[PDB]
């Protein structure tokens, strides 16, 4: 990553063993569940196209999964070539060159280059583009390896509403459909798959109540000396 | 916060990717428990609101917990707006503008405004202030996500009293109990549901013991049984 | 390891105690698996040769594997010196001195001289060259301690297609077979050892299908409809 | 109701007793059916607010559903006057008087003014509006008493594509969603385990695969035969 | 639809629901059988887009056929915009404007425009245009489900020829196969699957001949004649 957003000295240093450890844990012990997606981004803060290449190849030994990320990113870079014909003219005073596709994926661009653009003012956002190309790759990984579906997130009979809501919301966040398709699942699916008493409370306040208000009312019914309704 | 570099001139910098890594080891270990808010107190030391929003943004797995925290800010932010009269931008030429709720929360404010507000006369500690909004949001997520009720914590025959006291004080912590409620619970409920080994000594102590005195009576070092809990 | 400056040249710092701890846990957990390579590559971004020697020194386990790797390394160093490999940067440096094989590996070169070569313009990239020579041995230990197995692979009777796709990738990676062969085995053996009712799909897929197009049409095994297992 | 006559001019006729029986027959004897609306539309052609009120109040069966319809048109009539204050600002001779929503629902307007709007040129859609508000009632009454469920319909590994479209679009006559949700539904959601033959067939068709072909796809030896049933 | 009652005719009426119920009977008895297509043209003489939408919406189920029909209509509407570039913003009541594809489909057009294009000088054929695209719809339905096996057909032991060739014909018309194939089937399969004495006398005629000649030649026993009404 880059390790200084102002300072020139020691601008960038190679990846942490905790970043690798915890990367390897999500793709193995959480086994490509949808919570991978937002977690990837929290890892990638200030990551260079090379750091990103390191993250692409460090997905827990899963070689076939490397191929589905890899072919994706490359198609996206080949697309960047279709959208951007090459300027060779005078570069303006203080300005850098504009990246190519093979530059975005770090094949043609120096690591000084990658640092340069990432600390430029206004930024040339190469790592923030490549990581969204990688999440698109990553999204394919989650569909083949984990059978998780927002359709089939179901609240258990003695199950806490907080554990069922955590599953629905992490599964929701990794959908790539629009914000209207998203806002519909929290109105429809979430109320519809809660237990009888919690479903009754969710519709009673209606889904226009805040999540904490929903949450506190749903723990309140499912808390001490509970009734598991038969189904 | 302020650098750790022990050559020359101290200079103010953001939160570091090593610290970001540390927060990720904290989250994916303690996650939502009472045990989060003190680690947070540590790692957010000399943070600006921009760091605080980086601390929020670099969370991965638990997107409900984050929707409740993002939510809890808006309501305290709005409160702040309702508490103070603020006109938009400078009220006078060449003097600083007054903070709004959304400025405390980093959204509507630049980082260059942010270190301005802090170097005002008197100081406006916009981070420190903001950390309180965050911690109420944390306390809300933790109370709901925490799993033991305070009204059903009982000590078995082979359970160490240290382990049961940490679970009781951590259950009284999850539920955000007043000191008046903690002093009454301490006195009452605790003594009762200790095992008869601790309990008959706890009962031999006279009116209004300190928790030190409850431990000195009970302890009773080592055991119960073979190879006691250190968690 | 070498850390980057925003303008100007790379600077050498001492290795992290965790990087060391991480690598040991790597050679305990993954030695006989093709997971040794991406982790080793991950823990040797911006490494010098003394970084690469420190990682090799750190191991106190798996001594017969290190020995095979060491005799292997000397084979491409002796080759270096005799049959003059192609490389980027100076083949006859004027103002500094020819890298030998031993020097690339760092048994006869001081750390200054290695920095000397990597800080050069054009550089002589001694670190990356060495890491290829360790990765040759990493393949060798993976081949010797996990032998031929690509022909014996079958998709299980109850096994989803992607779980056995995921194994075929691991197997074929472990296999070390020629790239004309890798490309045939992905074209026809991947279909050959598959489920029979999934192979009917795979025939309509053809040879030039992506993994994602194949993992989308064919999923789990699936089973008799309208039945229940025997009692 | 109003009859159209030459030059597109409008001429008035009293409500037939046969139209009213016709409407009691569609309400009671095509009860709750989506088909209820288009028949309705064919009964309400040139209807004044008065003819609609007679239509609605003529009916004596199904009074839980006429109640939600009376609540829905009241709400819509009071909504209307927020959005448009009648006769705002400067008053202009030459106008029939503007309809408030209480005139639209026929509550503060007389026959003379009801004829006023519809013999105007261009015709003021007073009765047309009320019908579109009543169809909102009827579509809601349809949703309320339909039996199909959106959490039952999905394509499993034995189901034809047709067989699932028929049921799913049978759902959505009753159950309302956006097209972005319907498109996401057919892309991925309700199709997670969908028929292996259909996948085989869908690939075998190429990049010239049509919806008509995809419906014709998939047959076996259960259910109806292949022999024709239409004289 | 638009009556031809009255001097200088251009007068719209509602469709009678009896007419709607006679259409419920055609589809009850004949489904989508090929002679539903010109009946549907006959039902929709002088009809509007709103009438048509009414006649479509009153159909009993078939929701996969309804979709396939609906997307078929949406592509003819879409190319219709490509074949006639027409534009509009907000629609003005009373104003003669050029119809777009959406206005020809009843989707965007109020009924006064629809009648208004129909009764312009020249009449602009908006009812025709869409009725033609619904007939292409039905014609698509007929392609998919009307064919059944003609190779079933063999003349019964006591069967006269005028029952067996009509039955040949009824199944031949059922199949959607191109004409020159059908001509082939006439000169071969009608003769080859015929009884011994028949096929013989059909080989004496030569099957090249007119159907009057085949009826005269292959003559069988008289009586009432089976009218073909057992299915």
TrEMBL record, chains A, B, C, D, E:
Gene Ontology CC terms, in alphabetical order: host cell nucleus; host cell plasma membrane; host multivesicular body; viral nucleocapsid; virion membrane
GO aspect biological process, one term: viral translational frameshifting
Location(s), subcellular: Host cell membrane; Host endosome, Host multivesicular body; Virion membrane; Virion
Keywords attached to this entry: Capsid protein, Host cell membrane, Host cytoplasm, Host endosome, Host membrane, Host nucleus, Host-virus interaction, Lipoprotein, Membrane, Metal-binding, Myristate, Phosphoprotein, Repeat, RNA-binding, Viral budding, Viral budding via the host ESCRT complexes, Viral nucleoprotein, Viral release from host cell, Virion, Zinc, Zinc-finger
Cysteine-cysteine disulfides: 198-218
GO molecular function annotations of the record: identical protein binding; RNA binding; structural molecule activity; zinc ion binding
Complexes and interactors: Interacts with host NUP98.
Family classification: Belongs to the primate lentivirus group gag polyprotein family.
Function summary: Encapsulates and protects viral dimeric unspliced genomic RNA (gRNA). Binds these RNAs through its zinc fingers. Acts as a nucleic acid chaperone which is involved in rearangement of nucleic acid secondary structure during gRNA retrotranscription. Also facilitates template switch leading to recombination. As part of the polyprotein, participates in gRNA dimerization, packaging, tRNA incorporation and virion assembly.
Protein name: Gag polyprotein
Species the sequence originates in: Human immunodeficiency virus type 1 group M subtype B (isolate NY5)
First-to-last residue of the parent protein present: 133 to 363 of 500
């Amino acid at each position: 990553p880059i390790v200084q957003n102002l300072q020139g000295q020691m601008v960038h240093q190679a990846i942490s063993p905790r970043t690798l450890n915890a990367w390897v844990k999500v793709v193995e012990e959480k086994a490509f569940s949808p919570e991978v997606i937002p977690m990837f981004s929290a890892l990638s803060e200030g990551a260079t196209p090379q750091d990103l290449n390191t993250m692409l190849n460090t997905v827990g030994g899963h070689q076939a999964a490397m191929q589905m990320l890899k072919e994706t990113i490359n198609e996206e870079a080949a697309e960047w070539d279709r959208l951007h014909p090459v300027h060779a003219g005078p570069i303006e005073p203080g300005q850098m060159r504009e990246p190519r596709g093979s530059d975005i994926a770090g094949t043609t661009s120096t690591l000084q280059e990658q640092i340069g653009w990432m600390t430029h003012n206004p930024p040339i956002p190469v790592g923030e583009i490549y990581k969204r190309w990688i999440i698109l790759g990553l999204n394919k990984i989650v569909r083949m390896y984990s059978p998780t579906s927002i359709l089939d997130i179901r609240q258990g009979p003695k199950e806490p509403f907080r554990d069922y809501v955590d599953r629905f919301y992490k599964t929701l966040r990794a959908e790539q459909a629009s914000q209207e398709v998203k806002n519909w699942m929290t109105e429809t699916l979430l109320v519809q798959n809660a237990n009888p008493d919690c479903k009754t409370i969710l519709k009673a306040l209606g889904p226009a109540a805040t999540l904490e208000e929903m949450m506190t009312a749903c723990q309140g019914v499912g808390g001490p000396g509970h009734k598991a309704r038969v189904l």
